[PDB]
Amino acid sequence: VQLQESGPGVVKSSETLSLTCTVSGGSMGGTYWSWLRLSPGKGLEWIGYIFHTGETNYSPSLKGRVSISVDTSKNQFSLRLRSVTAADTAVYFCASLPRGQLVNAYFRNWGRGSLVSVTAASTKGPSVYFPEPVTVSWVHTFPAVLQSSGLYSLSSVV
Amino acid sequence: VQLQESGPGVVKSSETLSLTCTVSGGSMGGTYWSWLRLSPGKGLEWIGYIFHTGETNYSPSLKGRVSISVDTSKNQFSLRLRSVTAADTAVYFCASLPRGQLVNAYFRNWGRGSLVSVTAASTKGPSVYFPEPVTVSWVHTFPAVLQSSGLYSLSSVV
Amino acid sequence: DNVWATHACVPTDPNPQEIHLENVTEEFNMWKNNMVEQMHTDIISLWDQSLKPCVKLTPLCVTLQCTNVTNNITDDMRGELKNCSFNMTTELRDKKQKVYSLFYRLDVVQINNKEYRLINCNTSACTQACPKVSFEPIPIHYCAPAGFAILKCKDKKFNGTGPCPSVSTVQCTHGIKPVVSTQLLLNGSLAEEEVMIRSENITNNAKNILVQFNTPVQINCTRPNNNTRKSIRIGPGQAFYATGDIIGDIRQAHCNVSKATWNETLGKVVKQLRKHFGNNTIIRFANSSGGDLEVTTHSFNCGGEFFYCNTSGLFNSTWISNDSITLPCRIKQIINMWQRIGQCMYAPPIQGVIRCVSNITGLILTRDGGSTNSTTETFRPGGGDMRDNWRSELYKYKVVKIEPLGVAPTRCKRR
Amino acid sequence: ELRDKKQKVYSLFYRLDVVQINNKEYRLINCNTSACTQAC
Amino acid sequence: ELRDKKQKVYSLFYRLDVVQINNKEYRLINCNTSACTQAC
Amino acid sequence: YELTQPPSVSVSPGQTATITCSGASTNVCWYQVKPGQSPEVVIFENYKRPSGIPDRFSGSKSGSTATLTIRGTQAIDEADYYCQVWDSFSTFVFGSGTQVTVLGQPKANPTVTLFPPSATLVCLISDFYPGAVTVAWKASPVKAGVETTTPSKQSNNKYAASSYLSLTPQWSHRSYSCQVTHEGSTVEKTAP
């Protein structure tokens, strides 16, 4: 099978997040469709899996703001997150598990991974640049820095 | 198959005409049920036909003021004419056509034909007679004349 | 070796045996054989079997309100598609939802913005073709049970009626795809030496004359607009797929046939036609004169979409003793196919552009017989009856029953 | 035939096919036991 | 039975049978795949 | 197209009667009509004929005009005839209609009467055979406010009609004349 995910790449802070991972060339018989998150500041983490009967399971650390639904008509399953803070920026995968023992089960048939960036900033020009990374040409180019306010800053010297 | 019409014989001017031709002893499979009109001053003239899936075909001279509908439950089909003037007085037949090529097709299974007369006159008495033809006895009785206003007049002399 | 479901059909054998009988003369008859009617009944019943596990779609036809969709549409086919905005029951049976769908003019009628209703639900409710099932034809081999033998014609000059000098038997028929066509036979089995003419009575104009090509002519029918499909839920587990917003412009569906190859093929047909009528008869081709849409227009399927082609630019010539002809093929969705009262189809739209490359094998013409001993005969396309479509593929077959008993005089005695 | 519209239809029924529910509200006798199939 | 008049009924379903849709509203767990068949 | 036909053809009983429908590119079809009776097809292509028809009905076509031939004219052939072809735009087109009459009784002259009012002027025309009668009015002829009765059969079985005119009480004109025309014969009767 092949799994493809889709969703917005920019969501505002304290806003309900949405994602949708579709399944092609297969069926949802006897599989645990799961969601996985790769963060750079906290490593790999687990979100939750869902079975085709509507029976769900979630991670205990994210319980209370996560909800995963299934729809076998359009052959896809979806994630929803609630009250997303600034620390939830990561890349999100969708994977599958075989039915049975989860003690030796390993995640297989991974997706591409849609990168989701969270923010609460606004449009502001640089004072020598949140919506657009500005380019300076006159030298060497240095990468940008994310501040705690959600802004950007760079430097360039010849 | 036998066909029989049913409808009013007097229709007021600038009003919607309606007729219904019923089908007995047969089925609506693969025939073009049609309508025909015989005017005494304009000759025989075609109205339109309907197929059993609702694929209609009206004459281009009367397009926009005619409507033919088929119903497979009560085993009948109907005609509707809109904005009838005084020049549409005729007798109306209903006939069928075989499915296939119309290049050699001929109308068969003709009905009786119900005369429909359209008028725009009112009730008055003869000044020596729209609702009743008056009889005068004293001689010779002679046929009546329809004026352009829709009234009647006769003559009688010994 | 889909609608034509072979999961309930037995697998065939590899390399089926064929025995060439030598000193036999069999009186064939392609117009009165009984396997064609059995094929038609099997196709109808199997089609109805394949329609059983799909969506019923009976509550759909609520009173529609349709505007003209007109966005950057081209000059021709203006006012064909409609933007209807109706509202429907949802999964919960106490709420509704206002939705929109795109429909053709040939699917909706006016009931009196003006209100519209579907053309189907005055007679019956259409049944959706649920989208796991495809309409592509696959070959089907007809076998024979024990005691019955299938005899196959092998005369190369065979008009379908009369005795045959060379007869061979076989247990299995060849690959016979149940192709859907009305005027131009598609993907059929070709002839061998010339183009052949088969009919009931060649001096009778009420019987469909049938011709079969020697070389194929390629046809390319495609639909250029980029439509999309959206899923609208009408209940707990039943989905109706409506046409979404179109990406790009709006164009009509083209159909291409090469001009010189079709002219050469028509030359072959008119050369083989005049052996039945005379060497000085002027032969003309005019366009069809049907009453409904299916007889007037060439109709087929393209993997989910049903086409209806004008085909006036092909049959327009007279014959006396890299340019491609284009045809404005048009699309309809509600299908009343086998001409039965009160049963129909909703074909869902196919996402993305669609392309079909096929080739024409036979034509179903119809004579226009004016008078006896004349000098001009004009031919028109036609059909509609689906028995003649499969009669061009089952001509070289017949079924017989063996009676192995026999008596003979001899000199012997039982003790 | 339209799912949103309704009409007013009158008919005559014999006394053995209707029952009084609680003086001008009646219903068919078959409603609380079955659903009849009309002989076509 | 009379298909114009509704009623307000009450029942006891289990926790493993209803899903929150979001005094709070609820739906049955099996009403996005297929309707059931009650065992006679 | 119009599919032009002769308006009326009158023949003696016992001989032939030929009607022509011109301007027909495609195969013709003929219908006949009688008053108070359903129409019946008679010749459904160029030359053929359906079952249950008498032997006096036959048709032929030469070029673009088609002719129907009658072998025997009787009292049951007093009917109108319409020719029919097929056209691509208008799917069925019909002819004007040819009237066939048989001479059961010989030619007799009409009689005309005129009466003054006390305000409509009456011209009564009675007892003529056959029914082909045209009328005319004179004062300086007038084209305004005249209506003509269609001919009909009475108990005499010999056709009659009438002609009416309404005049404002110009009683300016000192002469007023009513004219009749029956296959050549003209009778003039008139006055203040």
Ligand SMILES: *[C@@H]1O[C@H](CO)[C@@H](O[C@@H]2O[C@H](CO)[C@@H](O[C@@H]3O[C@H](CO)[C@@H](O)[C@H](O)[C@@H]3O)[C@H](O)[C@H]2NC(C)=O)[C@H](O)[C@H]1NC(C)=O
């Ligand atoms: C194939 O079709 C032809 C017509 O294209 C059939 O031949 C026709 O057969 C009919 C019926 O027997 C003949 O009509 C008869 O003719 C004469 C008067 O002409 C008379 O005996 C009868 O009153 C009757 O009308 C007709 O002449 C004949 N020929 C033509 C040129 O029409 C033929 O029978 C058909 N073949 C088969 C095998 O069915």
Ligand SMILES: *[C@@H]1O[C@H](CO)[C@@H](O[C@@H]2O[C@H](CO)[C@@H](O[C@@H]3O[C@H](CO)[C@@H](O)[C@H](O)[C@@H]3O)[C@H](O)[C@H]2NC(C)=O)[C@H](O)[C@H]1NC(C)=O
């Ligand atoms: C078979 O081919 C013939 C000839 O090409 C087609 O006849 C033509 O049909 C079109 C239909 O649109 C007619 O055009 C329309 O005609 C009138 C003109 O007064 C008007 O209403 C419209 O503006 C429009 O132009 C066209 O006149 C007609 N040609 C003739 C000579 O009658 C026919 O449609 C084809 N039939 C089939 C079944 O494909």
Ligand SMILES: *[C@@H]1O[C@H](CO)[C@@H](O[C@@H]2O[C@H](CO)[C@@H](O[C@@H]3O[C@H](CO)[C@@H](O)[C@H](O)[C@@H]3O)[C@H](O)[C@H]2NC(C)=O)[C@H](O)[C@H]1NC(C)=O
């Ligand atoms: C006559 O036979 C030809 C043989 O090529 C048929 O063309 C083939 O039609 C099928 C069904 O529409 C096409 O399959 C489809 O193709 C694409 C890509 O896989 C996709 O839309 C579907 O998954 C499906 O497989 C096939 O590509 C096409 N072949 C070619 C070479 O174009 C044709 O349909 C037949 N014509 C009839 C039955 O009228």
Ligand SMILES: *[C@@H]1O[C@H](CO)[C@@H](O[C@@H]2O[C@H](CO)[C@@H](O[C@@H]3O[C@H](CO)[C@@H](O)[C@H](O)[C@@H]3O)[C@H](O)[C@H]2NC(C)=O)[C@H](O)[C@H]1NC(C)=O
């Ligand atoms: C099937 O194709 C034939 C091809 O002849 C169509 O007949 C032609 O249709 C056009 C468009 O309706 C008629 O109009 C003419 O078009 C152009 C401008 O676009 C111009 O030549 C004229 O001003 C006129 O408007 C045309 O008269 C007609 N006939 C011919 C002989 O060309 C036919 O409409 C098509 N049928 C169907 C059912 O789609």
Ligand SMILES: *[C@@H]1O[C@H](CO)[C@@H](O[C@@H]2O[C@H](CO)[C@@H](O)[C@H](O)[C@H]2NC(C)=O)[C@H](O)[C@H]1NC(C)=O
């Ligand atoms: C068909 O009509 C609907 C409305 O009934 C159109 O949908 C609206 O499209 C406009 C223009 O983009 C948007 O602003 C609205 O939000 C849409 N409304 C909804 C409910 O979707 C639709 O675009 C039309 N389809 C066409 C023109 O193809």
Ligand SMILES: *[C@@H]1O[C@H](CO)[C@@H](O[C@@H]2O[C@H](CO)[C@@H](O)[C@H](O)[C@H]2NC(C)=O)[C@H](O)[C@H]1NC(C)=O
């Ligand atoms: C379903 O659609 C119809 C129209 O198709 C809606 O009818 C509207 O009703 C309101 C009052 O409820 C009127 O003010 C509007 O004018 C109506 N609209 C139109 C276009 O006529 C109807 O409300 C919709 N919803 C339901 C739940 O039935």
Ligand SMILES: *[C@@H]1O[C@H](CO)[C@@H](O[C@@H]2O[C@H](CO)[C@@H](O)[C@H](O)[C@H]2NC(C)=O)[C@H](O)[C@H]1NC(C)=O
């Ligand atoms: C059928 O043939 C026509 C005419 O050759 C093709 O139409 C042309 O297509 C090309 C490529 O798509 C366009 O650039 C031209 O503008 C078209 N010519 C016109 C509109 O006059 C058509 O694409 C062919 N269809 C096929 C091969 O499916």
Ligand SMILES: *[C@@H]1O[C@H](CO)[C@@H](O[C@@H]2O[C@H](CO)[C@@H](O)[C@H](O)[C@H]2NC(C)=O)[C@H](O)[C@H]1NC(C)=O
């Ligand atoms: C129908 O489409 C096919 C496939 O595109 C066309 O065949 C191609 O024709 C060109 C002509 O120059 C050749 O170069 C290609 O090699 C052909 N491809 C194949 C796969 O055969 C065909 O010409 C089209 N038919 C027409 C226009 O009548």
Ligand SMILES: *[C@@H]1O[C@H](CO)[C@@H](O[C@@H]2O[C@H](CO)[C@@H](O)[C@H](O)[C@H]2NC(C)=O)[C@H](O)[C@H]1NC(C)=O
């Ligand atoms: C269905 O309804 C009918 C009509 O009310 C019931 O029949 C009557 O039931 C009452 C119950 O008290 C009896 O006293 C009557 O004698 C019954 N009448 C007849 C004609 O049978 C019937 O019992 C109901 N069925 C159910 C509830 O299963």
Ligand SMILES: *[C@@H]1O[C@H](CO)[C@@H](O)[C@H](O)[C@H]1NC(C)=O
């Ligand atoms: C919608 O289409 C119809 C049919 O062609 C037409 O009469 C009407 O004017 C069109 N309306 C608009 C706004 O273009």
Ligand SMILES: *[C@@H]1O[C@H](CO)[C@@H](O)[C@H](O)[C@H]1NC(C)=O
């Ligand atoms: C049609 O297409 C053009 C070109 O893509 C697009 O810009 C435009 O919005 C569309 N509509 C009109 C009215 O031109």
Ligand SMILES: *[C@@H]1O[C@H](CO)[C@@H](O)[C@H](O)[C@H]1NC(C)=O
């Ligand atoms: C078929 O050909 C045979 C052999 O010439 C001939 O007897 C028969 O009449 C032909 N049939 C038709 C319909 O042409």
Ligand SMILES: *[C@@H]1O[C@H](CO)[C@@H](O)[C@H](O)[C@H]1NC(C)=O
């Ligand atoms: C004609 O159509 C068949 C359909 O199977 C295709 O395979 C073939 O390539 C085509 N051409 C021929 C036989 O020349």
Ligand SMILES: *[C@@H]1O[C@H](CO)[C@@H](O)[C@H](O)[C@H]1NC(C)=O
């Ligand atoms: C149709 O639209 C989709 C969605 O934008 C696009 O990916 C696809 O390439 C389009 N197809 C064509 C043939 O232009």
Ligand SMILES: *[C@@H]1O[C@H](CO)[C@@H](O)[C@H](O)[C@H]1NC(C)=O
């Ligand atoms: C017609 O031409 C063919 C082919 O040359 C020939 O065999 C035949 O005899 C000709 N028939 C007549 C009647 O001239």
Ligand SMILES: *[C@@H]1O[C@H](CO)[C@@H](O)[C@H](O)[C@H]1NC(C)=O
């Ligand atoms: C059809 O043929 C006629 C001549 O018979 C010609 O004038 C006309 O242009 C042709 N039409 C088409 C669409 O090929």
